[PDB]
Structure 1
Amino acid sequence: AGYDRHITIFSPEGRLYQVEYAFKATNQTNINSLAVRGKDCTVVISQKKVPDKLLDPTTVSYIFCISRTIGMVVNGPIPDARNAALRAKAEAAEFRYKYGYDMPCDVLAKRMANLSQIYTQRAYMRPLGVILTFVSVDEELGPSIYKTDPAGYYVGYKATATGPKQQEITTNLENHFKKSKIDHINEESWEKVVEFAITHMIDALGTEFSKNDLEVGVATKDKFFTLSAENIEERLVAIAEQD
C-alpha cells in the first residue's frame, strides 16, 4: 500500500505528505521577496531575476495586479502562480457586481485560502505549489498584509518575506521592530518606505542590485501601481548618497 504518500490522506504519523511537499515547490525558482507595512500605505519589493537576455524585462514580473486597490506578489513557479492569479481576479469581480463595493485585502486572501482548502481536502486535485501574498490598503484597518499558504491557512503579518532565505531575512525585519517597539514604519511619505525595504534587503543578501534586478510594487490608498525602471533606479541613487 505504497500509494498513501502519493495523495492527501491521513498518515500514520498524523500529518499530510503532499502538503509538506507543496511548501518545497516554492524554493525551486529561488526568488527572495519581502513586504512591509508603511504608515498610510504598503510597499512590497521583489528580486527580479532574468536568466536569459532574450526575455523582455517588462513582460517578466513576479508581482501581479488583481485590482486597482489590491496588489499581489507570488513566490514559486509561474504556472501555479498565474493559475491562482486569474482565479483571484474572478473573485474580485464577482464581489463588485453581486456583493457590493470593491473587495478589501483580507477578503481576497480568505476566499483564495478557502478555495485551496477544498482542493487540498479533495484527493483528485493537487494543491498549488506557490504562496499567495496580497498587499493593499483598507479603508478601515489601514495597511495590512495577508500571506496565504498553499495549505489553505491565512494569517496576518506585520512585515513578511518569502524564499529559502526568508528565515535569514525575517531576522532583519524582526530586530528592527524589537528596538523601536513599533508595528509599522512611521514614515508618512511612500518614497522613503520604498528605500527602507531596499536597504534591509541589500545588507541581508550582501548584493547590490540594479534597475533590472528588482521590482518594487507600491500599494497606496485606493490605488496600486508598479514602479518602472526609471522609478526603481531613482530610489537606488538616494540610498548610496545617504548611506
Structure 2
Amino acid sequence: GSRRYDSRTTIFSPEGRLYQVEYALESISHAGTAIGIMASDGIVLAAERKVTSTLLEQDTSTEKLYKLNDKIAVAVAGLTADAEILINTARIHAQNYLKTYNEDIPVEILVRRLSDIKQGYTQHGGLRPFGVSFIYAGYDDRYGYQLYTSNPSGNYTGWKAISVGANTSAAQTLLQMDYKDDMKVDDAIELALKTLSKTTDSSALTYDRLEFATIRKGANDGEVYQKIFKPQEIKDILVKTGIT
C-alpha cells in the first residue's frame, strides 16, 4: 500500500529531535532576516526581502509585514504561502475573541493559539510543518508592549529584542551589545537598521529591499497606533541614520 512512500513527518530521531521541525528551521535560516525591538514608548518591526529585481513593485507589496489586528502585527520569515494560512486563522481567532468577550484579544493568547496549531502538525496527522517563523508585536491593557517569537516547533518566547531568518546568531549578538531598557522608539528604529545593515549579504541596504513598522501609542492621541512605513517614508529614514 501507501506505507512505502510515507516520510513519517512526526517522529523522533534516536537523539530525540523532530526531523521535520529541524529541517524546517534550517529552511528559515536561509530566508530574509526580520528584526523586532521593543522600547519603552513603542515597538519596532523591520525586515529585508531577498534580493529581487528593479522591476518588482514596491508600492503594492507588503510580503513580510502583516496586520493581524487593530493592535497586533507580525513579521514573517519563511514561506509566505505557509505564513498566510496561519495569518488568516490568527485574524479569525482575534475576531472570535472580540465577538465573545467584547474586548480585544490579549497578545499572548493569540500567540499561544497559533503556536498550538503549529505544535499540531508536529505530533499528529502525518503532514509537513509550516516553514514559518513569526515575530509578534502588539499591545494590551495588561502587559502593555509585547514582543514574541514562534517557530515551526510550536515553541514561543517573549523578548525585549529578537531576530528570525538568516544570520540570527550574528544579529542577536549585535542587539545584545547595543540594546538598553530606557530606550526611546526612535533609538530602537536606528538599532534595527544598523543591525540589518551589518548582517546583509547584499552590497548595500536600500529602501526597495526593506519593510518597516511601528506599534506606537500616540504621545497626543493617548491610544495605540500602527504604522506600516511606505517606500517614501523608509527612503527618508534611511538618509537620517546615515546610509543614503
What TM-score, normalized by structure 2, do the two folds share? 0.86
Letter in 2 for 1:42: I
Question: Residue 213 in 1 paired to residue 209 in 2?
Answer: yes
Q: Quick check: 1:33–1:46 contact (8 Å CA) kept in 2?
A: yes
Cα distance in 2, alignment partners of residues 74 and 84 from structure 1: 11
Compute the displacement of 1:225 (Å).
1.9
Cα distance in 2, alignment partners of residues 22 and 203 from structure 1: 25
Could you tell me which of 61, 64, 67 is aligned with 1:65? Answer: 67
Does the C-alpha gap of structure 1 residues 15 and 171 become closer, same or farther in structure 2, counting only changes over 3 Å?
A: same
| Unmatched 5+ stretches in structure 1 | none
* Equivalence for 1:81: 83
* Equivalence for 1:106: 108
Letter in 1 for 2:191: F
Does the C-alpha gap of structure 1 residues 10 and 166 become closer, same or farther in structure 2, counting only changes over 3 Å?
A: closer
Question: Residue 199 in 1 paired to residue 210 in 2?
Answer: no
Does the C-alpha gap of structure 1 residues 132 and 195 become closer, same or farther in structure 2, counting only changes over 3 Å?
A: same
**Greater shift after overlay, 190-199 or 12-21?**
190-199
* Equivalence for 2:14: 12
Q: How many residues align?
A: 234
* Equivalence for 1:44: 45
Could you tell me which of 130, 146, 149 is aligned with 1:147? Answer: 149
Q: Quick check: 2:71–2:215 contact (8 Å CA) kept in 1?
A: yes
Cα distance in 2, alignment partners of residues 16 and 49 from structure 1: 28
* Equivalence for 2:173: 171
Cα distance in 2, alignment partners of residues 160 and 74 from structure 1: 13
Compute the displacement of 1:204 (Å).
4.2
User: For 1:98, what is the secondary structure of its paired residue?
Assistant: helix
Compute the displacement of 1:124 (Å).
3.0
* Equivalence for 2:121: 119
Q: Deviations along 1:25-57, whole A, 9 cap, x unmatched?
A: 2134x3012111111110111113452344321
Compute the displacement of 1:141 (Å).
1.9
Percent of pairs identical after alignment?
27
**Greater shift after overlay, 115-124 or 225-234?**
115-124
Compute the displacement of 1:4 (Å).
8.0
Cα distance in 2, alignment partners of residues 47 and 92 from structure 1: 27
Cα distance in 2, alignment partners of residues 6 and 193 from structure 1: 44
Q: Deviations along 1:75-132, whole A, 9 cap, x unmatched?
A: 0111111111111111111110013311122111111011111222113332111112
Q: Quick check: 1:172–1:204 contact (8 Å CA) kept in 2?
A: no
Does the C-alpha gap of structure 1 residues 226 and 185 become closer, same or farther in structure 2, counting only changes over 3 Å?
A: farther
What TM-score, normalized by structure 1, do the two folds share? 0.86
Could you tell me which of 182, 186, 204 is aligned with 2:183? Answer: 186
Does the C-alpha gap of structure 1 residues 25 and 225 become closer, same or farther in structure 2, counting only changes over 3 Å?
A: same
Does the C-alpha gap of structure 1 residues 55 and 8 become closer, same or farther in structure 2, counting only changes over 3 Å?
A: same
Cα distance in 2, alignment partners of residues 225 and 9 from structure 1: 42
Compute the displacement of 1:228 (Å).
0.8
Letter in 1 for 2:43: T
Q: Deviations along 1:194-231, whole A, 9 cap, x unmatched?
A: 22321233244385422212111111232212011121
Does the C-alpha gap of structure 1 residues 49 and 25 become closer, same or farther in structure 2, counting only changes over 3 Å?
A: closer
Compute the displacement of 1:169 (Å).
0.7
